[PDB]
Amino acid sequence: ASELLFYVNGRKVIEKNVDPETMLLPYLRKKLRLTGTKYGCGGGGCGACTVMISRYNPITKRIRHHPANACLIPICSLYGAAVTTVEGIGSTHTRIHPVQERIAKCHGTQCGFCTPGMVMSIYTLLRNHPEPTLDQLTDALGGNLCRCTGYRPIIDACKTFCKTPKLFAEEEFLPLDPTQELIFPPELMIMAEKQSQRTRVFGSERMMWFSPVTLKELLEFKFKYPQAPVIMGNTSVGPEVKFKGVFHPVIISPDRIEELSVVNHAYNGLTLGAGLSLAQVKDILADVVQKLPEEKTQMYHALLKHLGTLAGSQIRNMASLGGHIISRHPDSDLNPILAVGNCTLNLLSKEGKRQIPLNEQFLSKCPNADLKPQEILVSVNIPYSRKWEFVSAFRQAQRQENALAIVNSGMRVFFGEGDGIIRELCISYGGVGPATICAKNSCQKLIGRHWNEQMLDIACRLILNEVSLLGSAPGGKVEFKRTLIISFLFKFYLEVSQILKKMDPVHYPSLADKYESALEDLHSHHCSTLKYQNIGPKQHPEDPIGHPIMHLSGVKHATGEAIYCDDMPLVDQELFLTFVTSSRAHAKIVSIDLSEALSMPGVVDIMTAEHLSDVNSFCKFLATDKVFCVGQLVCAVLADSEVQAKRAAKRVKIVYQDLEPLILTIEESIQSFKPERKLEYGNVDEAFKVVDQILEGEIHMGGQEHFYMETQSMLVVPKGEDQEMDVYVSTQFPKYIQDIVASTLKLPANKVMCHVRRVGGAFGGKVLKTGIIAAVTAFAANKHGRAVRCVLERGEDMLITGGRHPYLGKYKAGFMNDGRILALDMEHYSNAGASLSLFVIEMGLLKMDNAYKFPNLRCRGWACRTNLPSNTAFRGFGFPQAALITESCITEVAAKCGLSPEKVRIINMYKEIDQTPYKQEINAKNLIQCWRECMAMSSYSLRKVAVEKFNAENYWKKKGLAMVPLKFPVGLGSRAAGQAAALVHIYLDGSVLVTHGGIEMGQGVHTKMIQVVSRELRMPMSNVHLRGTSTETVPNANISGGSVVADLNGLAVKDACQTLLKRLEPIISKNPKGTWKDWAQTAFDESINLSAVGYFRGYESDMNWEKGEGQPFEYFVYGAACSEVEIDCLTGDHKNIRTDIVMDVGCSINPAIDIGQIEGAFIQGMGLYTIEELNYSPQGILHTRGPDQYKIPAICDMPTELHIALLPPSQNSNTLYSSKGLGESGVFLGCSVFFAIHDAVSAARQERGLHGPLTLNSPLTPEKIRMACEDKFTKMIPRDEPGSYVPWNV
Amino acid sequence: HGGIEMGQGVHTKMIQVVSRELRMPMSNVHLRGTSTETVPNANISGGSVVADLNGLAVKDACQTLLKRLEPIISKNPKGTWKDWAQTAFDESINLSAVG
Amino acid sequence: NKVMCHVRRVGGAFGGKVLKTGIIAAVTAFAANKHGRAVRCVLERGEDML
Amino acid sequence: EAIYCDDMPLVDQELFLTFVTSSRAHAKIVSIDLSEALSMPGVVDIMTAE
Ligand SMILES: Cc1cc2nc3c(=O)[nH]c(=O)nc-3n(C[C@H](O)[C@H](O)[C@H](O)COP(=O)(O)OP(=O)(O)OC[C@H]3O[C@@H](n4cnc5c(N)ncnc54)[C@H](O)[C@@H]3O)c2cc1C
Ligand SMILES: CSc1ccc2c(c1)N(CC[C@@H]1CCCCN1C)c1ccccc1S2
Ligand SMILES: CSc1ccc2c(c1)N(CC[C@@H]1CCCCN1C)c1ccccc1S2
Ligand SMILES: Nc1nc2c(c(=O)[nH]1)N[C@H]1C(S)=C(S)[C@@H](COP(=O)(O)O)O[C@H]1N2
Ligand SMILES: Nc1nc2c(c(=O)[nH]1)N[C@H]1C(S)=C(S)[C@@H](COP(=O)(O)O)O[C@H]1N2
Ligand SMILES: c1ccc2cnncc2c1
Ligand code: MOS
Ligand code: MOS
Ligand code: FES
Ligand code: FES
């Protein structure tokens, strides 16, 4: 019956008979046509859907602004609220807001897909803190992920708001005017001013939603519908219904009930209301710890600590305290701390008040200790600590911030009296079972004992007995979890045996000098410097080549006006396509049952391989009789809406029959015929006879998800004449989309056109699978004579799409005692997934050499078919894998030689003039110069001894340092692959329209082409415009990949402009002072054509793989990278302190864009080598929930200090304006972090007496780090027999 | 091309021109329409000369394409257009032309 | 370079789809831009003749 | 199946433009009153030369 009234961007919104299942993110985009708020992941993780919620409190008479993720907000909970969106704060047609201006002009957008989310986080903080500190801004951005920029640009923009040659003019930014901000809509203030008691009701066929606005009403609805969930923030229930198949027919969702918002400062503690957000609790507790004595604020410190790392700011401002406590997540960070602190819950029912303790039995949901079905949590009591009462909280995860815990803990002690006899003890752990667990029996046995090391040894063992983990346990990481449990117990000992020394120094002993670093955690600050050339006096001041010109679409990224593929409006009567994918790794499809699915609401069609017949293949789209991996396409469900399609897809019943063998690993794939790729240089077998030492070793390397922020997206629109299709798709290869769609429809290419304006990141993962999906989508569209849209959710996308190839490298190395590798016999193995990969092996081998001359070399490679998602090409294209393995070989030799890796790197380096394994002459002057400048700027030698100084002084924390050189050759297989084309029109007003085969993915290609046009035609960039990329305008264009897009399309764009000048030479000479409008007009008047095709034939390139020699590369991008880290030997955490990068780029066409490519590549590499990890079960299922969640780098992961230098220009008359195409280059430089961690672990291994075989694999995770730092805790843990259990992973 | 189909059958005549000049069936040629995004600065479709003048421009483009493909066509006289186009791409010869 | 005009076919013209067509398109595009919306203008036969 | 301009599908949220035309051959426009017209259902805007 009730109406849903709220505001969005100042404008009233009324929905009558509203569906209560409607979420805000869909509503904004589809119903309000506000497409700036984006879909990234759909679980609150990435912050792409960040918005501002505003509410008036009629009691306190103040407007409260908080951030939130729109993907989890149900619109029925917005009654009387004011949503603000990226569009709301400014636009190009109104006026640009400063946050929008600065994030763009600081070059903080590349692909731009994360920009609106960043803007709304920044904007929201500024509305609460107009004069902020940088900490407050970076804390707000804790939940905001970016895959392109590396964060530094966004942090520079944040600094401009903080009181305290460049890429951007900070002084030119208009100042923030807090008095001229958006007024909170006055009507909502009037609505709140009358405290209506009317309980609101919304409904549909599926759901009934009750919003009680009083406590009396709330309890009345809790009696009626006892099993209905009380929705507050929807950050627990929301993700469960979204992808754990849960459904609630009745929802109770109360408004701000004053009893649930209580903040009572009691005599013996405080009572916090169940409706308070976690962010509000953090403020309340941060306030009291600053104004009460430390003796009483012990519990509030522990909660503060874990609230600092709990998700990001968006989830904290949504999630409620009561919701946290009641939802009882096993990996809850707060509940273990609450468990140990004698906290009690204030319950309330219709039939009265009640109070129960928050104990292990409550956390394990024992009915007699739980809430009754008819009652609610009103508030929680958290008492003040007494004298000699101490509490600590610990946690470890994949990264420091915005990531679920692997293990966490709360631990309390009580001594009383003052002596050292322990009188109470509660020790709770999370992430080690289905619920939070208290070691009640261990603690009972420890009562009466003293606080000494003899307690620890026994306390560790009976804890290890009590908190048992089966080797098959959910989450995996069993051996690591075991260690963390006792390693936190060790840290707790040290914290307590220190506050005791502080308070009572004569009785208790001082800590061991080397041990003290265990207590301080690894915090952060973000410093950076950017060196580059700035030509110059010779050049015309309006020539834009060399200048740091902002990305053309950058401000539109900031305002949300940039249209990405799904942002295209609803086409009349369009349908939606979604796929049923395989749930088995290698099985026979015995049957499919579409009966229930076909009958369901909105369903137009469901296609199997049968229904595609002879057009189910290219150069198979849907599975036929067998499946060969999880995530393979099986059915295509077509419906009138997205929800209807997803619903019907879940009721498609497929039954399988598993098949042997189930091949998952590379070793398993090695047991018909694979083609070999080989490089022979010198004579390896004779070299092995004349070397001081021989060394065998290997390293495995994990894959990598692309994690483009824009998921796979397309709109396929049939014209309704001559079977014409228009295909709008986020892809890197329009020509391939054209071909596969045309082929599928059995049409000539002239009927199918593919159009691409922009792609929200790609990195290689928007090519082959994109076309398969576009082919299937276009089949449906043609079949039903309707436009069809296919956009994948993040889970589907990661499963359906591939990743980077996992590698295995095997090497046998002969070397001298000074560290010269005179013989090397290399083997590469790529994990291909279900299909072939060999392109990647080839580039692996050709770029394997990197910075080093290997005078006798035998490099061999083989792609390996497994039953996992079919992996694709990735930014780096074999080099990140092939380079790491040679550095691994170098590091193992260094160890045997007693020399540092950097001495072995410099002794094996290519000389100024030298030759590659494939007989190409190279000028490695800039390789050497990059290495030297990187040693100098980083002050390597001085920091080297500072790290050795630290390591000799610290036992439980170590630092490490590494430097790595870069040679990234650029060049495709052949001349035809590197050809490119453009089309340039000059209109009679003098304005220019240009286009070309290249695709904007965030790399700023289109910006560079306008810079090229500006130079060549001698006109401002404002006078040139580009719409996008199309097969209708420029045919037969090659893939946008290989670090050469701007490089090659730039030459074609140049070619077109020069053709136009040749024609206009007569016109220009007769009127030198004339404008372009005059020249264009007088050209038309004299019948001179003002349209021209541009063309570049391509770089000459060849490779004879029989002989193993050729000229495949046009030029070489050189560099070096130094990185420093500190590790936590107890937990396995690490911090990246500093990273210095020097890079030969030739003459940069745009140093803002080119520096942005280095940072992005570097951070994408850093992730690959450290924190990015895909977990697969023994049955080939990808794990995607809990601590198994996949984590790209965040702001917390970004190096604290970052220096980037570009080497002065080098003159290369074979490329566009002597520039070098980077983009892929910097990825490998992130292994500097890998080897810095490798060094740090070696320091702990040397001190402790652990010599010999140190092979750490990539990704170098906290699991791998901590288990490498062996000690009494690693040797102590329980261990299972290898084959006695089935593991969760590997 | 810059010309507009008003019912006078201009587009039909341009495909007839393309069919003669490239020596291919009319079924192998397609036209979608007219656009300032593809062909700039086009004069009015009037004066009894639309097909007349746009036909000469369409002819001009086809001949430009043959000049480039003359090497390709002589080495393989029996070949199809698919073969000639493919081998043109393989040898970095442009297959787009203004008329 | 910001404005593109696309024409697939015309259902007869004979000279009468030039100057007034552009006037109407100019006015129509002013509205579309003003309100940030697609705008369609199709005349009835009486209006058209007048 | 031949698509003419008005045969193009409804674009999402598109508006419609129609003209008020002159009913006199040579006269002065002493005034225009858009008051009733502006208040009526669906009306987004009415433009004069102003
Ligand atoms: C992206 C993301 C990251 C996260 N990261 C972390 C992390 O790092 N660490 C961590 O510890 N947690 C994390 N969480 C979990 C989060 O803290 C909880 O989901 C949240 O605290 C639950 O609060 P809520 O208000 O959303 O509960 P809701 O989803 O609204 O409700 C959950 C349950 O509690 C019940 N309930 C709620 N209020 C009451 C009441 N007053 N009386 C009775 N029953 C009630 C409901 O009936 C329901 O069954 C994360 C969640 C997300 C989505
Ligand atoms: C590669 S040097 C270069 C690069 C960009 C521009 C430029 C020169 N000129 C020359 C002025 C020309 C002379 C020829 C016809 C058009 N008029 C404007 C400008 C001068 C002043 C403002 C903007 C520009 S744009
Ligand atoms: C102006 S003479 C003219 C006009 C139209 C066609 C034509 C000749 N040819 C030549 C065959 C060419 C030879 C060159 C390459 C392509 N093959 C088909 C045809 C023969 C048979 C069927 C259709 C056609 S299309
Ligand atoms: N922001 C952004 N940068 C990116 C990519 C991307 O998808 N987004 N892709 C990379 C890849 S894999 C390649 S091959 C190059 C291609 O463009 P370029 O040749 O102009 O550098 O861009 C790189 N940089
Ligand atoms: N069916 C049809 N035929 C038509 C017209 C038309 O609108 N429809 N316009 C005429 C006019 S006024 C001119 S100028 C010519 C232009 O086309 P052409 O030069 O190709 O004949 O077509 C003539 N024939
Ligand atoms: C198909 C898929 C990926 C590719 C990456 N780089 N070059 C060519 C490719 C062809
Ligand atoms: O060539 Mo980039 O898409 S791996
Ligand atoms: O030239 Mo025809 O439109 S009178
Ligand atoms: S946070 Fe909602 S889209 Fe990723
Ligand atoms: S620009 Fe931030 S995700 Fe691409």
Contact C40 D4 (CB under 8 A): no
- Whole-angstrom distance, CA of residue A885 vs CA of residue A1223: 21
Q: Do A315 and A267 fall within a single domain?
A: yes
In chain A, which residues touch C (CB < 8 A)? 93, 985, 987, 991-993, 1024-1025, 1027
A chain contacts of residue B94, beta-carbon cutoff 8 Å: 979, 981, 1093, 1095
CATH of the domain at B56: 3.30.365.10
- Locate the ligand 5 atom nearest the alpha carbon of residue B51 and give its number: 20
Record the resolution, in angstroms.
2.7
Q: Which whole-number Å values give the CA distances from B97 to A87, A981, A1054, A1078, in the listed order?
A: 42, 11, 17, 27
A chain contacts of residue D11, beta-carbon cutoff 8 Å: 569, 572
B chain contacts of residue C11, beta-carbon cutoff 8 Å: 7
Which of the listed residues A1040, A1072, A1101 is the one where a domain comes to its end?
A: A1101
Q: What are phi and psi of A994, to 5 degrees?
A: -125, 150
Q: Do A179 and A309 fall within a single domain?
A: no
Give the list of residues 6+ apart from residue A846 with CB closer than 8 angstroms, or none.
A679, A918, A969, A1103, A1112, A1113
Q: Say if residues A76 and A16 touch (Cβ distance below 8 Å).
A: no
Exposed/middle/buried for A164, CB within 10 Å: 0-12, 13-18, 19+? exposed
- Whole-angstrom distance, CA of residue A1211 vs CA of residue A1197: 37
Q: Do A1287 and A1181 fall within a single domain?
A: yes
Q: Which of B7, B35, B44 sits opposite C6 (nearest CB)?
A: B35
Task: Please report where in the chains the tokens 């508006």 appear, as a residue.
Answer: D15
As for how many domains chain B has, the answer is: 1
Q: Which of D1, D3, D12 sits opposite A569 (nearest CB)?
A: D12
In angstroms, the separation between the Cα of residue C19 and the nearest Cα of chain B is 11
Instruction: List all chains that touch chain D, counting a touch as 3 or more CB pairs closer than 8 Å.
Output: A, C
Residues A666, A672, A674, CA angle at the centre, nearest 5°? 65
Which residue, among C1, C4, C33, would best test binding to A if mutated, counting the most A CBs under 10 Å from its CB?
C1
Q: Report CA(B48)–ligand 5 centroid distance (Å).
A: 7
Angle, to 10 degrees, between the axis of helix A298-309 and the axis of helix A278-291?
Answer: 140
Which of the listed residues A1032, A1066, A1101 is the one where a domain comes to its end?
A: A1101
Other C-beta atoms closer than 10 Å to the C-beta of A201 total 14
Q: Report CA(A857)–ligand 2 centroid distance (Å).
A: 54
Q: What are phi and psi of D13, to 5 degrees?
A: 65, 20
- DSSP letters for A108-124: --SS-TTHHHHHHHHHH
Contact D15 C40 (CB under 8 A): yes
- Label residue A750 left, alpha or beta by phi (over 0 means left) and psi (-120 to 50 means alpha): alpha
Q: Do A497 and A507 fall within a single domain?
A: no
Which of the listed residues A777, A801, A825 is the one where a domain comes to its end?
A: A801
The residue nearest atom 3 of ligand 7, judged by CA position, is A764
- Residue of A878, A779, A842 whose CA lies nearest to A1224: A878
Cα A285 from chain centroid (whole Å)? 31
Cβ of A540 less than 6 Å from ligand 2: yes
What is the β-pairing status of strands A575-581 and A788-791? parallel
Q: Which whole-number Å values give the CA distances from A46 to A35, A139, A311, A1021, D17, in the listed order?
A: 17, 14, 10, 34, 43
Q: Report CA(A150)–ligand 6 centroid distance (Å).
A: 25
List the single residue in C with minimal CA-CA distance to D47: C31
Q: Do A344 and A272 fall within a single domain?
A: yes
Task: Please report where in the chains the tokens 């990015």 appear, as a residue.
Answer: A1172
- Whole-angstrom distance, CA of residue A387 vs CA of residue A401: 32
Q: Say if residues A712 and A800 touch (Cβ distance below 8 Å).
A: yes
Q: How many residues does chain B have?
A: 99
Which residue, among D12, D13, D15, would best test binding to A if mutated, counting the most A CBs under 10 Å from its CB?
D12
The residue nearest atom 2 of ligand 7, judged by CA position, is A1041
Q: Please tell me whether residue A27 adopts helix, strand or coil conformation.
A: helix
> Dihedral sign, CA of A308, A310, A311, A314?
negative
Of A1109, A1224, A1247, A1281, which residue is the catalytic one?
Answer: A1224
Cβ of A542 less than 6 Å from ligand 2: yes
Q: Report CA(A222)–ligand 6 centroid distance (Å).
A: 58
- Whole-angstrom distance, CA of residue A578 vs CA of residue A646: 7
List strands edge to edge, sheet with A200-203: A200-203, A208-211, A250-252
Q: Report CA(D10)–ligand 5 centroid distance (Å).
A: 30
Q: Do A220 and A274 fall within a single domain?
A: no
Contact A979 B92 (CB under 8 A): yes
Q: Do A1176 and A1278 fall within a single domain?
A: yes
CATH of the domain at A102: 1.10.150.120
- Whole-angstrom distance, CA of residue A167 vs CA of residue A703: 34
Give residue B27's domain range.
1-99
Q: Report CA(B68)–ligand 3 centroid distance (Å).
A: 18
Structure-determination technique: X-ray
Contact C1 A93 (CB under 8 A): no
Q: Is B33 labelled a binding residue?
A: no
- Locate the ligand 6 atom nearest the alpha carbon of residue A768 and give its number: 2
Q: What is the DSSP-derived secondary structure letter of residue A730?
A: -
Give the list of residues 6+ apart from residue A1248 with CB closer than 8 angstroms, or none.
A1270, A1271
- DSSP letters for C1-50: -----EES--S--TT-SSHHHHHHHHHHHHHHHHHTS-EE----HHHHH-
- Whole-angstrom distance, CA of residue A1052 vs CA of residue A1046: 10
- Residue of A556, A570, A565 whose CA lies nearest to A30: A570
Contact D2 A721 (CB under 8 A): yes
Q: Please tell me whether residue A170 adopts helix, strand or coil conformation.
A: coil
Cα distance from N-terminal residue to C-terminal residue, chain D: 42
Q: Say if residues A927 and A967 touch (Cβ distance below 8 Å).
A: yes
- Whole-angstrom distance, CA of residue A965 vs CA of residue A967: 7
Q: Do A701 and A711 fall within a single domain?
A: no
Q: What are phi and psi of D49, to 5 degrees?
A: -55, -35
- Whole-angstrom distance, CA of residue A971 vs CA of residue A1260: 31
Three-class HEC string of D1-50: CCCCHHHCCCCCCCEECCCCCCCCCCCCCCCCCCHHHHHCCCCCCCCCCC
Which residue, among D3, D4, D17, D21, would best test binding to C if mutated, counting the most C CBs under 10 Å from its CB?
D17
Contact C40 D2 (CB under 8 A): no
In angstroms, the separation between the Cα of residue C49 and the nearest Cα of chain A is 31
List the single residue in B with minimal CA-CA distance to A1095: B94
Provide the total of helices (H) and of strands (E) in chain A, helices listed first. Answer: 39, 48
> Dihedral sign, CA of A360, A361, A365, A369?
negative
- Locate the ligand 5 atom nearest the alpha carbon of residue B10 and give its number: 20
Contact D17 C39 (CB under 8 A): yes
Contact C6 B46 (CB under 8 A): no
Task: Give yes or no: A1224 in active site.
Answer: yes
Contact A569 D13 (CB under 8 A): yes
Q: Report CA(A181)–ligand 10 centroid distance (Å).
A: 27
Q: Do A1050 and A1003 fall within a single domain?
A: yes
What is the β-pairing status of strands A913-915 and A857-865? unpaired
Q: Do A355 and A396 fall within a single domain?
A: no
- DSSP letters for A624-681: -SEE-STT-EEEEEEESSHHHHHHHHTT-EEEEEE-S----SHHHHT------EEEEE
CATH of the domain at A399: 3.30.390.50
- Best residue for ligand 9 mutational test, from A24, A41, A85, A121 (most atoms within 8 Å of Cβ): A41
In angstroms, the separation between the Cα of residue B77 and the nearest Cα of chain A is 23
- Best residue for ligand 9 mutational test, from A27, A69, A73, A1192 (most atoms within 8 Å of Cβ): A69
Tokens of A685: 């077998």
Q: Do A796 and A718 fall within a single domain?
A: yes
Q: What is the DSSP-derived secondary structure letter of residue A29?
A: I
Q: Please tell me whether residue A701 adopts helix, strand or coil conformation.
A: strand
Contacts across the A-C interface (CB distance below 8 Å): 10
- Residue of A1103, A26, A25, A27 whose CA lies nearest to A14: A27
Judged by its nearest atom, the ligand closest to the C-alpha of residue B62 is 3
B chain contacts of residue A1095, beta-carbon cutoff 8 Å: 94, 96
Other C-beta atoms closer than 10 Å to the C-beta of A1222 total 25
Q: Do A817 and A909 fall within a single domain?
A: yes
Q: What are phi and psi of A1060, to 5 degrees?
A: -65, -35
Cβ of A1005 less than 6 Å from ligand 4: yes
Give the list of residues 6+ apart from residue A295 with CB closer than 8 angstroms, or none.
A385, A386, A387
Q: Which whole-number Å values give the CA distances from A951 to A521, A604, A1173, in the listed order?
A: 17, 67, 29
Residues B10, B38, A1071, CA angle at the centre, nearest 5°? 110
Q: What are phi and psi of A57, to 5 degrees?
A: -95, 115
Q: Say if residues A474 and A431 touch (Cβ distance below 8 Å).
A: no
Contact A721 D13 (CB under 8 A): no
